[PDB]
Design an enzyme around this catalytic site. Structure first.
Site, PDB file in Angstrom:
ATOM      1  NE  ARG B  17     116.135  -3.689 -19.277  1.00  0.00           N
ATOM      2  CZ  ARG B  17     115.820  -3.856 -20.565  1.00  0.00           C
ATOM      3  NH1 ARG B  17     116.616  -3.381 -21.528  1.00  0.00           N
ATOM      4  NH2 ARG B  17     114.688  -4.480 -20.888  1.00  0.00           N
ATOM      5  CG  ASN B  81     120.415   7.840 -14.332  1.00  0.00           C
ATOM      6  OD1 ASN B  81     121.635   7.664 -14.397  1.00  0.00           O
ATOM      7  ND2 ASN B  81     119.543   6.951 -14.771  1.00  0.00           N
ATOM      8  CG  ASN B 140     135.916  11.449 -24.405  1.00  0.00           C
ATOM      9  OD1 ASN B 140     137.150  11.366 -24.395  1.00  0.00           O
ATOM     10  ND2 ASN B 140     135.141  10.400 -24.599  1.00  0.00           N
ATOM     11  N   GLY B 142     134.807  13.281 -29.766  1.00  0.00           N
ATOM     12  CA  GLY B 142     133.621  12.669 -30.339  1.00  0.00           C
ATOM     13  C   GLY B 142     132.391  12.958 -29.495  1.00  0.00           C
ATOM     14  CE1 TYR B 146     126.390  11.544 -22.144  1.00  0.00           C
ATOM     15  CE2 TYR B 146     128.613  12.035 -21.406  1.00  0.00           C
ATOM     16  CZ  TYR B 146     127.391  11.420 -21.208  1.00  0.00           C
ATOM     17  OH  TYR B 146     127.151  10.679 -20.075  1.00  0.00           O
ATOM     18  CG  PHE B 178     135.042   5.494 -19.395  1.00  0.00           C
ATOM     19  CD1 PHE B 178     135.752   6.659 -19.098  1.00  0.00           C
ATOM     20  CD2 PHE B 178     134.599   5.287 -20.699  1.00  0.00           C
ATOM     21  CE1 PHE B 178     136.009   7.598 -20.087  1.00  0.00           C
ATOM     22  CE2 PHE B 178     134.856   6.213 -21.690  1.00  0.00           C
ATOM     23  CZ  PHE B 178     135.557   7.369 -21.388  1.00  0.00           C
TER      24      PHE B 178
END
EC number: 1.1.1.36
Lengths: 239, 239, 239, 239
Positions: B17, B81, B140, B142, B146, B178
């Site tokens: 996806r 990815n 970033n 929060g 990541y 984004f």
């Protein structure tokens, strides 16, 4: 399938020889209506519309723009590629050595974009690309002035990118490493070797390799969301 | 004319996806023999060779490699990815939240490359691309975990680039801003707006836009001298 | 006149030998109440409060925090410096080689900060500094895994910086080049020379030189507006 | 204990008001023999040796150097801080607007260093620092020309760093974010708020905060191995 560059009008400054000629040549074989400005227009590129112009003179560039718009149509792409060197160690560099590179490499870049920009804004379309350099980002001995300007174009492109976004107009930079042109092919063999040994890829780059990076950024299809970016082509010489 | 990707075998991790599917889809329409690994293989991409595999398990990935090599041939391209998030403020993040993203996003990347690398070295050909991120480079809120991993892949790619150069094998990274996937399309409207206002281009990016950047780096024709580089696709969100 | 570090409580992970010892030593002669965690606490630093702890174990670090808070008071500064290498070319690196550096160098960093952070937030004061590296930013051959982690800490610090700003808490990173520690002093002479020739300054750096950069970032006086930054100390090895 | 700056002779361009005055003031309270050049020398800094000079004129700067050397002794430090803006959107910027910022901000920087450099080389000692900017690195709307120059100084410093290393002479740059000077304090309240909201630290920086970063780079004690570096002081506005 295809990069949206067929029938697109593109101007390449410094496009008679070297890297500029390579960019011109490849854009042509992508179906673009390419024009170039330079001090000489031999080329030997026949189908390319050479215009004698000087990036340090704004009247000269605005005239070339008029000529190009008139013969080929409204401009989509601009490659600000014309640049020179006046290499020397910092204390041996004269004001003339600073004036020369600052005019062609910094001022000359803005003067290459200024005559096409207002129209690009009207058409809400356009991709701008300035060249260089590994010296601009890393720094180089004997190139204290060349480097200031190639680092300067990156700042110009980032600000221009932020201004042009409201019109869907993109600005980016390509930062080549050491590239086999007729200029670098005349540099001493012992210096070529010292440099080539610094490059993990074990070779200087080729002009068609810079041309491909410029094409990628000009493509409205391949890089529609790429703006404000520096694309390094250096074989991992500078990472 | 053409990117040298026809009949090239390419593996995309996380390709069922989202962005991965988009990369798979575009490589296919460039004539590549694409395979993908994921936890599910629906797709609905029919012609793509889906292999159920887990990037956190090295046996699982080495098995997928064997299956893919056997059905499609020796591998030229790898797109690492697959990635996840466990978003929270630094003091609310549990060891499990660190273990999870570190496994998929850092370790899982190396485990995605490790089963194809020795062969690429033998054939003296190959292009490796890891994904991300704007959070990896900028940081970033929060996403303290990541971000550590998306900054980590850039370091992995730069070192891998320097190792693989003696075999003509390239490694690069794409750092998306984004992007409108099904995940980010479910984020609150008021947060989407706060973010979109930060982006000079005034929109999130599309997955086919990341796919194009990956294609450019995989092309042995368009980026033969590009290695060790980060290609930002963020609409000037981070410059 | 003075850096606001007198009577400030500072924890240095990996502070028994090497760079960590140097950071401990200098902070002491700035009037700080310094503590360190490590696997051994000899030191021979007498006045420093050595605590045997393991950055890969969160219980171990939370215990050390408790001990340090109890003996010295509420913590202002944290230097996440403990790190290891498992150097090898990418295909020779085992999962154990990845697990080891990822635990000490990435996870271990967060586990070094997690037990002091909530208190720093309460007191609305604190300066966090992670170490490294030139390999994290540039990439290095044989250090595909070390590099991923030293690039990872930069991303962790940038995100932590953005989270901690609402409490006046700062996070930054120091990226040393090649530094003369007992480890790098045992590396082969011919390799030391090959590297030293790459450095414009013509020498490896000294540990007290990294200590000074850490001090600058910890000073609430000298760097009160510095957060999210990477401070390179490499003698122009990487620019 | 102490930064090796007592009795050191330091020249600050643009040091009558604003950030320059702040740098002058702090260096003084570190025991340095500070001089400054500007268009006016009021100051009201009494003990500072103000010299009326123009960075765009090389005769003017070489004269100031002579005066300063004669009154205070051989120069150790140079802070190239004088800079101006001619803000406008790219197509509204006249050649005069380009000539002005390029002269003060790029050329003027080199002309500020050129009269002290040969002596620094003789004495095998010296620390050079150029200023700025967040706009130079990130880009800024309406500052397409300011940005080109502040990105240009970074390239100048990196090359100068590589040249000066064989003499133990260091060159670095400080890149301030938005700083409360009399100029930025007159900018509209609604624009100040829009910008301040972009800054995680929730405030503009103060001039004494830039002064501290410059001091750190000038210290032969605190940054002896720091050269070719950019030190960002932006409160995580740009990371």
């Amino acid at each position: 399938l295809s990069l949206g560059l067929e029938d697109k009008v593109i101007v390449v400054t410094g496009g008679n020889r070297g890297i500029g000629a390579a960019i011109v040549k490849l854009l042509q074989e992508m179906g673009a209506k390419v024009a170039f400005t330079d001090l000489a227009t031999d080329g030997g590129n026949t189908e390319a519309l050479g215009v004698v112009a000087n990036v340090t003179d704004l009247e000269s560039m605005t005239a070339a723009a008029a000529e190009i718009t008139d013969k080929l149509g409204p401009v989509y792409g601009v490659v600000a590629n014309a640049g020179i060197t006046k290499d020397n160690f910092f204390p041996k560099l004269t004001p003339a050595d600073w004036d020369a590179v600052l005019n062609v490499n910094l001022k000359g870049v803005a003067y290459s974009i200024k005559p096409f920009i207002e129209g690009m804004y009207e058409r809400k379309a356009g991709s701008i690309v300035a060249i260089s350099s590994i010296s601009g980002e890393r720094g180089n001995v004997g190139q204290t002035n060349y480097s200031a300007t190639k680092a300067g174009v990156i700042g110009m492109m980032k600000s221009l990118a932020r201004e042009g976004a409201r019109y869907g107009v993109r600005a980016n930079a390509v930062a080549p490493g050491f590239i086999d042109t007729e200029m670098t092919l005349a540099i001493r063999e012992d210096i070529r070797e010292k440099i080539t040994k610094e490059i993990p890829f074990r070779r200087f780059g080729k002009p068609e390799e810079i041309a491909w990076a410029v094409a990628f950024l000009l493509s409205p299809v391949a890089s529609s969301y790429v703006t404000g970016e520096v694309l390094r082509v250096n074989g991992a010489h500078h990472t």
